[PDB]
């Protein structure tokens, strides 16, 4: 009914118009490598 001129949102190999960033590199809470000890804590390798 029409070929209306409009925006073709890019689906090609668009490598460099967008920039996925990271500044102040990773900051969040996750401490799941804890192990059991009393005063000298017996932790292992694990978690993050």
């Amino acid at each position, epitope marked *: 009914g029409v070929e209306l001129p409009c925006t073709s949102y890019q689906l090609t190999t668009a490598p460099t118009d967008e920039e996925i960033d990271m500044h102040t590199p990773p900051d969040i809470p996750d401490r799941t490598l804890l*192990s*059991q*000890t*009393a*005063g*000298n*804590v*017996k932790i292992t390798a694990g978690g993050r």
Partner: nanobody
Amino acid sequence: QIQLVQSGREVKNPGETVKISCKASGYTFTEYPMLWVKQAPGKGFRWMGLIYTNTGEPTYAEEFKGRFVFSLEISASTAYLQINNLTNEDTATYFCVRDYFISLDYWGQGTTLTVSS
């Protein structure tokens, strides 16, 4: 040295509380695990919980934590486990542990108390 010095024996009042005082010193009150211990009349040293003591928390178990409720001012190793809300089917031994490598690394003396008001 790991001196989880408990209270002595007991004839514990039904409906009341009895605070077996775990002076858990040299082992962990103020830095290390105070392992809270209910004591079975058959069951032996049963779980009232445990706590690594660098921050200052005691932790509870399923069968001994509950009616036995314990508090802990760990600076002198001070704490007290109340065999409390007493019934005739509530009495047993009691104990603690002074931990390291999350099983206990030293053993505390405990006290045996039979629930009878």
